[PDB]
Every structure is written in structure tokens, then in C-alpha cells.
Amino acid sequence: NILVIGTGAIGSFYGALLAKTGHCVSVVSRSDYETVKAKGIRIRSATLGDYTFRPAAVVRDCTLLCDRVGLLRDAVAGIVLISNGIDIEPEVAAAFPEVISGLAFIGVTRTAPGEIWHQAYGRLMLGNYPGGVSERVKTLAAAFEEAGIDGIATENITTARWQKCVWNAAFNPLSVLSGGLDTLDILSTQEGFVRAIMQEIRAVAAANGHPLPEDIVEKNVASTYKMPPYKTSMLVDFEAGQPMETEVILGNAVRAGRRTRVAIPHLESVYALMKLLELRTSKSLWG
Template sequence: MSDKKNVLLIGAGGVGTIVAYGIDYVGKSNLSIVVRRDYVKVKDAGYDISSVDYGNIKGWKPANIYPNVDAAAASGEVYDFIVIATKNLPDIVKMEELVKPVVVPGKTTLVLMQNGFDLGRPFFVHYPKNVILSGVSHIGSHNSGGVICQTQKDKAVVSYFENPNLSKEQQETKAHEFISLYSNDKNDCVYFDDAKWYRYRKLVYNASLNTVCALTGVDTGRLAFSGGLDTVSIPAMREVVKIAEADGVKLPSDVINSVVHSDDGDWFEPSMRVDVKKGNPVELEVILGNLLKVAGELGVETPILTVVYNLLKVVQFRLKEEQGLITLPKERPITDRVFK
């Protein structure tokens, strides 16, 4: 009987495919993947991968490839780990509901290899006895029709979203077990013992620079030269730090300076800016929406972040309408609401 773990990865895009290949490279898992957009091509010919970590690979595919979660469930396989590497858009798809057919309560460990903050909360509601791991990926990789181009090394930080129903030891054990399935001599996958701290640290950038660049249509360099860095983004960073402090998280005293200088020398377009430029919905709710919910619960005022969020909701509305996710009536309805 094989002692390999059954792993299902959902979301084999640019990042997800490199994660999947890394897991397959280690060889300690029976790997299955869910591929939606490029299913027919990948099922027939596999992925062509150009990777700074692994070199050039022609026609790679794992043992099992499914077009959707229901098909993965219908296979009868019981999964030890489910890695979710999709874009995180809960205002369009609620992943905690989508994965239900393949989750065994109390057994399956879910790995959220996604952007965002406070991601564990909806999963704990649905799966109160399951370990939910946090995977923060630092990687440059994109997918174009089943051709993967990885330009920056795969660096991943794994921890766990604290589940009060489970022991710390149980959750730590699962985190290290997943790392053993994924970490290899080509990538850099490490354990970090505080998911909340790490994701707050990442939010100092994402909630202030990623969002404002998406809203204004400029890169981080032009945001600085225009004055928007000083008038909008840095005040937004201060609000993130205040929320973190109220939530019991002490970020480094130089965190704002470090974040501002992280793109030095580069006219860098953050991911949300790129999404808007491509006409794709942005990860608004998990980056700003969840943060503002926590701020409200803690009584922290967030005037800058709130305005940025509400303006981006309008942008998100437009993006979803353009993709046919929202349908409006031909004639605009008339309201009797009185505005003051």
C-alpha cells in the first residue's frame, strides 16, 4: 500500500502550475489538478513550462487532470490535501462552497495559496474540524494557453490560520507535512509561525499600492512622481498599521519605508493594476473588504482605505459587467429615493 499523500490542486494557472510541478517533482504525492480554461489542451498535450527554477519542460502533466471539482469528486479519490491556487474572488465564486464535494470533514487539510487577508474565516464556518493552511507565494509566473513562463523564483511561506477547535500542535504538524510534499532543491518553501502577522505585512503593500495603482491606472513609480504616494498610499499604509496594532499585531517600525522602497528602480505594475488593464475582476474583497470588516469590528477608523475600497467597487462593477457577470436592464430604472 502506497504511503503517498493524495493531493488535489485547484487553479492550475501561472502560479498554480508551478506549485503543482514542484509537488510532483518531490514525488511524495499522488497529484491531481483541476484545470478549467485549458483543460482540453492540457489533458491532451500537457503544459509546456519555461521555468527559472526547473528549466524547460515539454508536455508535463500529472496523473489525473479534471475539468472541475465535481469531476475530481466523482473519481472517488479521498484527498489528504487540497491546494487552492485560484484567483481569490469571493464576490464571484465562494471557494469554501465550491470545494465541498472533495473535502472530508476532519480529515482534509486545505491550503489557501492565495492573496488576501483573513481567508480562513469562511472556511472555518464550513469546516470547523479541518486544518486550514496559509500559503503566501512570492513568484513571477504566468499562463498563456497552457504555456507557463516562470520568471521569478518560487518562494512560498506556509503557516496556518488558527482554528480554535484544533490544537496548535495538530495545525503545525499539517503545515510541516505539506512543506515536506512541496519543498525541494529548486524552490524555497519555509514555515512561518504567524499567518496573521505575515498577511498584515503583505497588506501594507497590497491595500495601499496595489489598490491605488489599480484605481488610478499608473505604476508605483508614476504614483510616487505624481504625489499620490504621499497623499493617498502612505496614509493608507498608516491605517493598515493601526488596524494591525488593534488586532494585536506589531509590525516593524520601518515597515512603511521598506514597502515604499520595495519597487525602487522599477516602473512596477502591481497585480491589481494588471488585472484592470486586462479587463479582469480584481481581488478587492479579500484585500480590502476583509480588512475593513476587521477594522470595523475593532473600532479603527479608516477614511482613506474606505474611500479607496468604495471607488474600486465601482471599477469592479464595470469589470464584472464587461465580462457578462452583471446584467443591467436596457432602460435605467427610476428611483423615488430622496438624496440629501
């Protein structure tokens, strides 16, 4: 029995997977309330398959959040937070002292209301924050595995998040600030800068008690040169006119560096420039 909050690509994609196997999944929706209470959500995928998600109910055991505190303000008697960023858990934990942290690896995009496009990957890593794996976590993971994707229960979700942040913190903002370059163009022409950012992330992770594998920077460089030219999720958001994950990726990494006094000038630079681009993008037609 599963409560999803909101109807974005991530919440809808993982909600619909749990709906497939045969769990009782509802959605709390705002922007798309009218369209989902009727037509539902259509998940389209060539690696998995086509499926349609019609929830058990639509109102205004496990709650998937994917105004955070307030969105769960009447939903908790396991909380599952699926996020691409870092340090997304403390705020929520403090208010509801089980938190299941979810780190998704997936190229999935919401093309229209009720319309999701799965392209690549799909893995969901899950574990308790700050660490640990409970039975619920294992049961959730098995549930996702059943539905077809990697559903990995991990005892060190926070280190895993830092490890993904090595890649995210470099390519996501560079793809936007460059005006839309793919990963291959970014890495092949400014490998040095990409490395400098990655090493900063590595040093902040360690300073926060979550050291990463020793050759993590070289691994991410080598693996990216083998990925086919790629469009980041930040760039998709930017091209869609939607809010970007700047704060939970890069802002949270910067604040983590400041707290531990790690020199992070490359991260500070990219962050400031993202904030400036956002300010420009934010300007009202009203002036």
C-alpha cells in the same frame, strides 16, 4: 498525494513544483478541462527553468485551493489555501472544523490556457490558521524547498498576511485606478498618499491582534524605491479582462477596520473607487 482545484497561475505553479520532486498531483478543472487532460500545463521560467506539468488525473491527502466551500464539497476526509489577501481562512475553517494557509510572493502570469510565465520571486510561506505549524506544514514546506523556492513554515501566517497587505493594499489598487502606472511612478509622485494607506493597514492589523514591525511603512517605501519599476498582479488581471482580487485584499482590510472601529478613510476611498471601476468594467454589451 495532492489535489489541486482549478488551473490558474498560482495553483498550477505550486502544483507543478510538487509534481517535479515526485508527488502524485491531480487537478479538478472546469474552464480548461479539455486542454489540460491532453496537453497538460507548461510552466516557463528563466530564474528556475522550463517544465511541463501533466497531472496524475483530471476530474470534474492535501487539497490546494488557490464557490470556495462548494469547490471542496467532496474533497476532505489537510486544506491548503494559497491566497494573496487577508482574512481568507475563517469561511473555510468554519465549514471543515487542518487548514494550511499559504501566502505566495511571486510575479507569475497565465498567458494562455496551459501557459504560465514565472518572472520574479517564488517564496511560499505556509502555516496553520490562526497560527501554529504542524508536521504536515513542515513536510509541505520542505517539499517546496526541495523544488527550488523558499518554502517557509511559519507559526504566524496571519501577521505575515497583514504585513504583505501593507504593500498590496496600496500599490495594487493605485496601479489600476491610475490607468496602469508602475510602482515607481506611484510612489515617487504620491508618497504621502501611499504612506497614509500603509499606516491605516498597520493600525487595522494591530487592532485585530496582529501588530506589525514598528518601521514597516518605512521599510516598504525604501524597498519599493529599490525594486525595478513594477507591474502589479492586479494590473495584470485588469489588463487581461479578468476578475481582480479587490475583495480579498482591500475589501477584507476595510471590513477588518470597520469591526475594530479604526479610522480608515483612505482605504474606504480606494475601496469605493475600485468598486466603481469594477461596476463600469462589469457592464454587459446587452445594456
